[PDB]
Design a binder for these strands. Structure first.
Lengths: 151, 63
RNA sequence: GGGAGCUUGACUGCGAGACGGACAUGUCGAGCAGGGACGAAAGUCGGGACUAGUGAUCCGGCACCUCUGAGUGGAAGGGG
RNA sequence: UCGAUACGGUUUGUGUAGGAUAGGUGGGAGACUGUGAAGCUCACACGCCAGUGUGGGUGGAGUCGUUGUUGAAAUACCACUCUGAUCGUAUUGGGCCUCUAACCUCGGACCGUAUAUCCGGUUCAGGGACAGUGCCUGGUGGGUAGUUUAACUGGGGCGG
RNA sequence: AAAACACAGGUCCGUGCGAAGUCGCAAGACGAUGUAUACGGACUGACGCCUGCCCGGUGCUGGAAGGUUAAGAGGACCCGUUAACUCCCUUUGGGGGUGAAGCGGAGAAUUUAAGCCCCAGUAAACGGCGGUGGUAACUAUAACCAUCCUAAGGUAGCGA
RNA sequence: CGUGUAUGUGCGUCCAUGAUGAAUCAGCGGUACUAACCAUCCAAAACCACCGUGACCGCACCUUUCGGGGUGUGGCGUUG
RNA sequence: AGCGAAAGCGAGUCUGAAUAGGGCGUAUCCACACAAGAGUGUGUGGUGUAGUGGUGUGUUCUGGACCCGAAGCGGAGUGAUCUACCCAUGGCCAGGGUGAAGCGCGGGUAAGACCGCGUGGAGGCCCGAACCCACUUAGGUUGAAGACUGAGGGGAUGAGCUGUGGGUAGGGGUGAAAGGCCAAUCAAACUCCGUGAUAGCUGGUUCUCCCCGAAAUGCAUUUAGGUGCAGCGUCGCAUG
RNA sequence: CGUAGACGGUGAGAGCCCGGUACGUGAAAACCCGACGUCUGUCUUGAUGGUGUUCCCGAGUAGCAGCGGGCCCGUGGAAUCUGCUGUGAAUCUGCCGGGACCACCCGGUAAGCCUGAAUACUUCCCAGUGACCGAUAGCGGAUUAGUACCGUGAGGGAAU
RNA sequence: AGCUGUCAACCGAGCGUUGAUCCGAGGAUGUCCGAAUGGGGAAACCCGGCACGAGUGAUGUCGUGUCACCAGGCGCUGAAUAUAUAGGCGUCUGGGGGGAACGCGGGGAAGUGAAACAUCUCAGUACCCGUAGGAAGAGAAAACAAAAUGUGAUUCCGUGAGUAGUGGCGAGCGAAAGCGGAGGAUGGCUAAACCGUAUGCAUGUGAUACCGGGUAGGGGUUGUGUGUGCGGGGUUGUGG
C-alpha cells in the first residue's frame, strides 16, 4: 500500500513522506488512527495530507488548554451564511461541524476540531443565535452561539 | 461463514477428485473473515463478514 | 552324435508359389541388394535334430523416418 | 541471531632465479614527504617455514630509474579492484523476545431495553499477531459409504 | 425371562471447564445452572481372600539425534521460437552450425512440517503366560541338579 | 360486578387548623480525589552456589586386542 | 477411383536404395495374340459397369422394447395416538405382618462398647388383592382373539404402576442390550417418486394348414443351467 | 332449394319438420388492437470536410499458479469459457483470440449495460378434428370421484 | 314467452309482453378460514385497542372503519460517548401466498449399463433450492475463419455427423467451422481536458487573475478539485 503520512511515525517517514507499507499495517493502524492517507493521486496525498497534518497540529487540545479554550470560546456570537426561503426559513442547505468550526475561527479566533460541536443536538434549522456546544475536553462544554443569515 | 456481506461471494461447488478418480462433491468456500467495519469515519465498528477480496480491495474500513 | 577352421543367416532389410488354419499363433522361403565362410569349382545358411521355454488388446517408454504439424514458419503433439 | 543480492577501505598473490609476497595488462621511470615513507620497543595482528599490513614518537628532503630479467620489475605510484578474512547502507529470508492496531474471549460494566443469561454497540480487562477458516497440501482414518472377494468340482467346502 | 442385561462396589483412561464427550455445516445445546470427592468412556460386577510373570506384536502416553517426508517462488541447467551472426550451394532464395533480449515449457542442487523409523513407559490396555529331563525332581508332591529359547514362561486358587 | 337515591360516619382546597421549614454568608472532618507517603507486593539488570554435563578429550571397562557405548578422574556453555 | 500413414500419386497405388515380388484396387464377360504349364499371366481390341429414393417384410440399434415377477438402491416427505426412552403435571397401590436407625429406661462397663426393656415404624422388607407382568400347563390354533382364554405363577412403597401434555425419526431415534422397539412389517420403518429398477433366473406368449427340419458337439469365456463363433436347420441366390 | 347435400335432433337412412349450415348482419357497455390531435422529449444554441503533438479509451480487472467445473476433449501437449484461493499487469510500440511461441500475419478496440422478431409450453377459455376408447375400454373418475373405503399420517383408492 | 337451477319428484305459493326466466359486460354485497396479517389458535373458532346507532338510571352487548411483520423512501429523535451513530417513534410505498407447463440460475442421486465394479454411464436425469416473464436466457465480437477487395449481434431449426474426436480407447460419449433456412433492428454510457456547473477540505497572504485577448480595477470563480452529483460543447481504429 502506497500512502503518504500525515504525522511523524518511526521509520515510516514524516508528515508528507510517501512510503509503501503492507496492507495490514496501513489499513489497520495508519488509516484508522489517521497517521497517513493512501496516495490516490500524488498531488492530492501531498496537499491534502499536509493540510490535515497542520490542521491536527493546530486543533490539538490539552488539559489546561481545555479550560483556556473554553474561556476563549466564551467570547461572543459567531455567524454563518446559508440560503433560506422567502419567509419560510427552510435553509436550502444545512450547517456542518466544518462550517461552525471555520466560522468560530474567522470570527472569534479559537482553533479547534470537528469533534467539538454538538451540531445535531443544537438543531440548527432556521436563523438566529441558535446555540451550539463545543465539547472542548472530557467535560468542558461551551454554549457558543451562532446566528444565521442569507447566503 | 461462506457468504460475503459486501459482494455476496457465495461458495462455489465442485468435485474433490481422488487418485482413483472418485469425484466427491465438495465446496470452495470464500475466505470471509469477521471484520469490524467502520461505515463512517465516526468509529462505531459494526461486525460483518467480508471476503478477503473485499478486505484487499478496500471495501472494508477498519477505521 | 564327437572334433576342429573360419564366421554371425535372427537375409537383418525386401519377398515365391504354395501350404498347416471355431475366431485370436506355424512349415519352405525359390527370387533381390548385402553376407559367412570353407574352399577350389560345386556348394549350403532367415538361432538351434524337432515339438515347450510364453501373454492379445489397451496404454504408454526409447531409437530411426524423404509422414502430419489446427492462419503461415517452426514447435508441442500425433503417425510410421 | 543467522542468510542472499549493487558496489566495496587497505594488505591479501614465497610462480622460477630471487632487492625477492612479482598488484591485474596499460600510465609507468617526478607521480610519491615538512600538519609528515623509513629501519624500531611498538598501535593493530596475518603466516606459503617469504616475512607481512596503515602508522602515532622517532621519523626527515623520503621510495624510485630494464636496480641483475624471473616478460608482467617491489603491491613507489594509474581502470577494473582479478584468487579474495572483514566491508555499510537499501531490497528481500529461517528463527527467538516483544509493542499493540487485526482477529479472538461464555471475563466485567454499560446502553439499545419497561421486559432480556439472546446479540450487538460502547468501554474496561485479558489473549494476540497466535488461534480461528479460506485455498492448496501431507498423514491418521471401518467413523461412514460403494463395492469386490473366480471357475472346475461325481452336491458344496477342504484339498487339487 | 435365563446363567443373559442391569445393578450397588471396584479399577483404568480422558477432562482445567461456552471442559472432555455427544447432537449439529455452523450458531447453539446437553454435559451442568455442575468443577477433578465432578463429569464422560472402557471393562469388571455385592461381600471375603486375591488379581502372580511379560511392554516382545498391536494400540495408547511421552518424546531420543538422525533419516524419509507433500504443499513453495529455491528456479542452476536444459528445450521451443528468433533480432541477429556465420558458411554451402545458389542470386527476383533455402540448407547446415552459433544465437542476445524476451516469452513459453519441463524443471535439478538447496529448503523446512506432521506422520513414519527410532528410545522409554503403559497388561484392572488389546493380548501374551515353553523346555529340560542331569536329579529319587521327594516313587502321591511343592522347591532342588543346572541346563536352551524368548518378554515371560500359568503364580495362588480351582479342575472329568 | 355496575347506575340513581337518602341518610350515618367520612374526609380536599382559595381557605382553615398541626408536624416540620432547612439551607444558605462565614467557617471543619471524611471520601480524600492533583501529585506525592506508608503496609503488602511480584520482578527485570547486573550477582554467587548447586543438580546438571546440548559443546572436549582420553583417562576403566563384561573388554573389539582398551581401540565402538556409557558412566567417574574436570575445567568447562550452569546451556535445561 | 482406388492405394497409402502423406509430400501424396492415381487405374493405379503401398511396401521397399533395388522397374525385385507381394497387398489392395482397376465390374463382368468375350476375341487376339505373346508368353509359362508354378496352378495361369500380359498387354491389345470388344459390350460398358448401377446406384439411389419411397415403401413391404425379417433381423437389428437406442429407447420399458414381447409380457409378468424380486429382494433390494436412491431422492423427498409421513409417522413416538403402538412401542423404546426421557421431560412437565396428576393419580393409584385392600388387607395383614416383620420389625432398622434414632429416642428414653435398667445391668455390665473405671466409664464406654455391648446386652434386655419401651417408644420408634426403615426397608428397591415379607405374605397378599387391585394394578402391572407373563414362569408352567391345557385349550384355542379357517380361534371368542393376526398372540387370547382357564388354572396355577412373579412383582405388588418401588429401579413401582399409570393418566394427561409433551420431546427424540430412519443409516436416524430409543434401547437395565433382545438386532429389541420405532403404528399387526425392522440387520435400516413407512408413503410417493427415480420406476415399467434390474434379474445369465422362474413363469406366460393367444388362429390354421403346406414344405423342410435340427441340437444337446468343438473352442473360448469372472465361464460351466449364460453367451460368441464354428458344427447341425431353413430360405434365397451361384456351381451342378 | 342449394353461396345451404356440415353435424345433430325428430317415434327407423331427413338438404327441404327442428336446432342449424352456406351467406349475411349485430354491440349500449367493458377490454384489446390501430391510427388522429393535444402532450413528451431531443435537433436546431448549427452543419462541412484536412495537419501535427500530451492525456483517454471501463482494475483488484486481464494475466499467472493451486485446486475444480465445463466443453468431442475422462488432466491430457490442453487452447478458449468458467468457480474458489492467492499473486496481479500496462491503455494503443496497449491488450486479447486464432487450441503454446514468433520478422509474424489476420480478427479488432474486453474487464459496465439494456435490446423486439424468429423460439418453448398450455392451468384456463373458444371453435373444431380423429382408418382414437366405447363402460373390465377410455382419465383413478360416463354414476358419489379423488367420492366411498383403507391408513395415525404422507398417502392408497374403487365399484356402479 | 314461458319461468321459480339440478339430482327430482310432490306440492303451496307465485312471477311473466309494463318484458320475466334466460344469456353478455360493468358494478354492489361478498360471513368465517386461508399469504391470513389486531392477539391467540387444534383453519374455518376464541379474545382485544378512536368517532357514531344505541342501551339506559348504567355496566353488559353489535355496526362500521382501523390495528401483523418486514424491507425501502421521507420526517422527527440520536442510547452507551463527545461532532457523530445502532435503535425508537410517525407517515407513504411495496413484499408475503397460489399456479399445470415452458424459462434462467444453483444443488444434485440411485436403481441401471459397463453381463462383476470404483473411472465412466445412468445424468446433469429424478428430485431439491432461488427466481421470473408472457415468453424467458443470449444478443450488437478484444468474434469466427484462414490469405478469399471471406462472413459480419444473438437465438432457433436442417445438415455437417453418429463424422473429427473422446473413452478402464471398455460400456459408451460426441462437437464445432462451414453450409441451407425462420427472423430480421448496426440504439444509448461509462474514460480524457475540461464547457460549465452544483456541492464534502486547509488556508496560504483572502490575488492567481478572471470573459479565452488585450486594456481599465479591487479584495471577486475566495484560489487552489482530491470526492462526488448533474445538462456535455463531450465522446470507436488507419482514433474520439
Amino acid at each position: 500500500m502506497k500512502l503518504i503520512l500525515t504525522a511523524e511515525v518511526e521509520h515510516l517517514g514524516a508528515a508528507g513522506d510517501t512510503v509503501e507499507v503492507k496492507d495490514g499495517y496501513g489499513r489497520n493502524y495508519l488509516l484508522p488512527r489517521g497517521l497517513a492517507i493512501v496516495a490516490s493521486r500524488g498531488a492530492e496525498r501531498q496537499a491534502e495530507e499536509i493540510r490535515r497534518a497542520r490542521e491536527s497540529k493546530v486543533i490539538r487540545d490539552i488539559e489546561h488548554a481545555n479550560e483556556l479554550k473554553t474561556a476563549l470560546e466564551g467570547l461572543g456570537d459567531v455567524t454563518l451564511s446559508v440560503n433560506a426561503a422567502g419567509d419560510t426559513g427552510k435553509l436550502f442547505g444545512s450547517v456542518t461541524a466544518a462550517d461552525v468550526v471555520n466560522a468560530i475561527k474567522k470570527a472569534g479566533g479559537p482553533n479547534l476540531d470537528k469533534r467539538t460541536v454538538q451540531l445535531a443536538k443544537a438543531h440548527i434549522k432556521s436563523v438566529g443565535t441558535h446555540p451550539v456546544t463545543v465539547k472542548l475536553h472530557t467535560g468542558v462544554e461551551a454554549k457558543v452561539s451562532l446566528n444565521v443569515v442569507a447566503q | 461463514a461462506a457468504v460475503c456481506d459486501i459482494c455476496g461471494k457465495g461458495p462455489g461447488f465442485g468435485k474433490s477428485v481422488s487418485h482413483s478418480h472418485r469425484r466427491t462433491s465438495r465446496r470452495w468456500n470464500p475466505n470471509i473473515q469477521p471484520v469490524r467495519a467502520v461505515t463512517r469515519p465516526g468509529g462505531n465498528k459494526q461486525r460483518i463478514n467480508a471476503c478477503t477480496s473485499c478486505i484487499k480491495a478496500g471495501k472494508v474500513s477498519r477505521a
